[PDB]
Design a binder for this molecule. Structure first.
Ligand SMILES: O=S(=O)(O)O[C@@H]1[C@H](O[C@H]2O[C@@H]3CO[C@@H]([C@H]3O)[C@H]2OS(=O)(=O)O)[C@@H](O)[C@H](O)O[C@@H]1CO
Ligand SMILES: O=S(=O)(O)O[C@@H]1[C@H](O[C@H]2O[C@@H]3CO[C@@H]([C@H]3O)[C@H]2OS(=O)(=O)O)[C@@H](O)[C@H](O)O[C@@H]1CO
Ligand SMILES: [Ca+2]
Ligand SMILES: [Ca+2]
Lengths: 472, 473
């Protein structure tokens, strides 16, 4: 029974790291990438926290678990992942793993402890279950101030980017690391197999770091991508609406957007130091050599691509794509360019740990890809499936199917679907849905989506067959 | 022995406009119906939204039982139609030998009246394909952007709020709904079979669009704006702030725009009164009126700037929650009912008139006892109404309100902030007393009445309610 460490980050994009030729120097994450299996085309299940995490830890889609929206926020109906979903946590506990959890759970108060883990520390540890949804009255007042032309300390906008007082050592990140360190030290003192999860608040917006991370990257030198700052042309209505109060960016200057980038870059550099600290402790404790590691972000974050901030009910690559590294110490490093899913994590954990089955696996184990490379999946369609059922009590029922060359997004709460040519338009600027030159590719993607919805027993397949009846 | 039944169903018609309610619009034909029938002066809709209110009206069951708990066919609702397994009063009436005819807005899924055995004579929904793409308001969004840049439409108007239409009464959708109503009554007079007619008027749904002379009949300059007009919402839930539909952004509205919204609305009500007179006169000419069993009702009210709100949204304020209701039974003396009644009470009233067979639960009660006996039918019973706002066009809110003559408690389970209004001292619902310890006793009573109502109708949200209200339990 191998020891397992999961390093799980909140809204960490795929593309920032120096190992991806990104603008931030990340030597410790780069070294883990180069020792392990790089999943360079990993996709999350949903660009939202609780759904992405329920998918990750159960191995089933939201329509099967019931966990299809964030919990505990205006105006979601949900409070917690059902305790009937044990997750990999209860399954690992059942076969003799000591499970430990540090940091943000976001699947209901006390959730890791209720499923048999040592919940060492985190926001969710000692909260009462079934709390009133967190309604963002303070964010609403602050964004009204920004629209009235006000700024916070030093010209900053604290709903987007913020210089924190003190040092790295005073940060929540330093505490997540210190608990990780204690988890590793304690595990080294037991004969018993260990399953450790460290869920970091970083780099969740607003992008908040102390010095020197706050000024490490000069806002004036940021390279803004081709889809930065644009008017959304023929895009669905849900991309326009102010779902969360900070989604009003009408007040944001190019300088505000550059600082969003520069402070995000600071957070990634601060994450790299944190990863280094935990890896080095694991080495000092004689655990690193045999440690089975997953480094993953629950989803990406928008830095003004399509004039969007944070995340919302959409499928653009900057949110849908996730960083993923899985290190099996028995295997030679490889780079997987075939698309993989957040639904593939739990099966990977299942094959490593010999977890008992607790029902369906909607994904597949990544072990064959890790051993054999992209050749494991030769012959097979290269597709990913993404859902955005809900955003914080708004229902959208969104589904996207992504090939290496094309993305089809179904928006059943709109009349307007999306079709992107990822080969000729990788920044997803032009919606080709009504473009007759793309009929053959649309038709192919509609059929692949109907196949995926059937495979996972999505009850929205009926409505899909109605909306897409021009193609069956 | 089985009575002829006519329903006149209006879209977003408020309770308070009519001259019989001492309202600002002269409505002699509705006034005459009110005087010959039973006035339900404290009628409440089930929901301030169209499809849910109409599913409740026609099935007699709450949306958690029918599945019809949001508008159909709109950004970004999940719904397209009432299940065909809900036959409604239409299928029930058909099965016992009623000729059922439907004119105008159904809003419960394309061809719905015809699938349930009605003659769907005319209406938006009559010839549509089922399972259509939701109508996404791209044009209304672009219009409201223009209004935010300080633009106006033709003649200084704002066509998402109020509009002078070209032509005359005779060119209007209302005139067509009336002509089809006239043909329904003419045809019914030729039949041995009992008749169940429904005329569902588009008016007076915003934007408030009428031809002359209705467009200028009421002078915007003379409108009396109520005490809750134009205010900053203090300690109100967040759902009242958000721009759910693009025209809910009223940051651009002048006091004159709001007065014109009133004055054009008043024009629509005067044009509705003419329409009602037309149909009542046809029914008298056809020798149907003397035995005709009639319901006049609006599916809900409409906000004209109370709490700085326009149209409707996920809230429970009286101007939206209250509905006009008149039920005329020709065998009975006129009465005024001040006891609260619900949209859930329509179907049971139809069931007792028509002897419709049971098709499952009735979440309301028949209004025949109140129509015969007056308010004292209910002596020794709590005077309550129950209101839900489960969804607004794909936003989930799960809202529930309990209203007594003196108090309203609104549960907002998608928020941390509930509402509590003293309707005796604050009937404009300006002050949220939820956190006011002087109102602990009234809150406690209303929480228990709500728990009882949720239990009575088997609402699955009762579990969450018990968690949110555990300080009571
Ligand atoms: O409770 S949390 O959602 O974990 O934290 C919130 C809030 O997170 C959100 O931020 C906006 C609003 O909904 C989502 C995002 O669009 C959610 O992010 S997600 O968890 O990554 O899906 C966060 O912005 C604020 O700083 O803290 C609150 C804590 O109540
Ligand atoms: O499809 S309809 O809803 O019958 O008509 C709509 C629109 O009505 C709506 O207007 C806003 C958006 O949702 C509701 C209201 O807040 C809805 O009104 S309701 O049906 O009474 O709940 C209507 O104004 C316009 O004429 O047509 C559109 C599309 O048919
Ligand atoms: Ca996240
Ligand atoms: Ca209506």
């Amino acid at each position: 029974k191998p020891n397992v460490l999961i390093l799980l980050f909140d809204d960490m994009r795929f593309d920032t790291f120096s190992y991806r030729n990104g603008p931030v120097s990340t030597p410790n994450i780069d070294a883990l990438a180069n020792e392990g299996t790089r999943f360079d085309q990993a996709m999350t299940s949903t660009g939202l926290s609780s759904p992405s995490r329920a998918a990750m830890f159960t191995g089933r889609w939201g329509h099967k678990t019931g966990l299809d929206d964030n919990v505990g926020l205006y105006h979601s109906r949900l409070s917690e992942l059902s305790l009937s979903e044990g997750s990999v946590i209860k399954r690992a506990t059942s076969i003799g793993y000591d499970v430990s959890y540090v940091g943000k759970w976001h699947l209901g108060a006390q959730g890791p402890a209720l499923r048999g883990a040592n919940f060492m520390w985190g926001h969710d540890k000692d909260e009462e279950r079934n709390g009133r949804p967190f309604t963002p009255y303070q964010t609403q007042k602050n964004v009204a101030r920004m629209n009235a032309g006000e700024r916070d300390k030093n010209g900053e906008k604290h709903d987007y980017y913020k210089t924190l007082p003190g040092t790295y050592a005073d940060t929540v990140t330093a505490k997540e690391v210190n608990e990780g360190k204690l988890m590793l030290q304690n595990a080294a003192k037991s004969d018993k197999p260990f399953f450790g999860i460290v869920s970091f608040e970083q780099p969740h917006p607003p992008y908040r770091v102390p010095e020197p991370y706050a000024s490490m990257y000069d806002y004036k030198d940021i390279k803004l991508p081709k889809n930065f700052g644009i008017k959304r042309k023929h895009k669905p209505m849900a991309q326009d609406d102010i779902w969360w109060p900070w989604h009003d960016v009408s007040h944001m200057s190019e300088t505000d957007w550059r600082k969003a980038h520069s402070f995000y870059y600071g957070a990634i550099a601060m994450i790299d130091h944190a990863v280094g600290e935990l890896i080095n402790t694991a080495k000092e404790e004689g655990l690193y050599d045999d440690l089975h590691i997953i480094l993953v972000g629950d989803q990406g974050s928008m830095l003004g691509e399509h004039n969007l901030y944070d995340k919302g009910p959409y499928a653009y690559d900057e949110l849908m794509r996730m960083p993923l590294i899985i290190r099996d110490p028995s295997l030679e490093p490889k780079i997987i360019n075939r698309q993989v899913s957040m639904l593939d994590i739990a099966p990977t954990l299942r094959q490593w740990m010999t977890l008992p089955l607790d029902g369906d696996e909607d994904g597949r184990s990544l072990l064959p890809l890790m051993k054999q490379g992209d050749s494991a999946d030769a012959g097979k369609d290269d597709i990913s499936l993404y859902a955005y059922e809900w955003y914080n009590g708004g229902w959208f029922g969104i589904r996207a199917i992504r090939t290496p060359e094309m993305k089809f997004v179904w928006n059943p709460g709109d009349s307007r679907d999306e079709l992107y040519d990822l080969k000729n338009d990788p920044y997803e600027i032009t919606n080709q849905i009504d473009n007759p030159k793309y009929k053959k590719q649309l038709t192919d993607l509609v059929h692949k989506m109907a196949g995926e919805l059937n495979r996972i027993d999505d009850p929205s397949l009926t409505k899909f067959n109605h909306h897409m009846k021009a193609f069956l």
